[PDB]
C-alpha cells in the first residue's frame, strides 16, 4: 500500500541551540580522574539544531 496521504500544511523550519550536548564515549577504555584529548566526529558546541 503506497497510501500517498495528503492535506499537508507548510511552515518554515525552526532552529534552536545546542547547550553543551551530544557527547559520547569514543572508546572502550577506562580512565579515572584524568583529562584526555581526543580527535573524532562530534557535534560542535552552540550549533543550530533543527
Amino acid at each position: 500500500q503506497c497510501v500517498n496521504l495528503t492535506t499537508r500544511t507548510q511552515l518554515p523550519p525552526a532552529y534552536t541551540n545546542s547547550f553543551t550536548r551530544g557527547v559520547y564515549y569514543p572508546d572502550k577504555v577506562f580512565r579515572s580522574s584524568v583529562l584526555h584529548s581526543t580527535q573524532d566526529l562530534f557535534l560542535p558546541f552552540f550549533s543550530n539544531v533543527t
Partner: protein, 50 residues
C-alpha cells in the same frame, strides 16, 4: 511530538573523567581563544599570563 536533528563534524575535544570513569565535562577546541588555551594547557584552569 517534538524533536531535534543536528550533524557531526571532525573536531578535537578535551574530556574530563571523574574517579568512577564517567565523562562529567568536556571542552571544545575551536570555539573560543580561551578554549584553545585550555586545550593547549591540558587543564580546565588558566592563570594570569600570555
Amino acid at each position: 511530538a517534538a524533536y531535534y536533528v543536528g550533524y557531526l563534524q571532525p573536531r578535537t575535544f578535551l574530556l574530563k573523567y571523574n574517579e568512577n570513569g564517567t565523562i562529567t565535562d568536556a571542552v571544545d577546541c575551536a570555539l573560543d581563544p580561551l578554549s584553545e588555551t585550555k586545550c593547549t594547557l591540558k587543564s580546565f584552569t588558566v592563570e594570569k599570563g600570555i
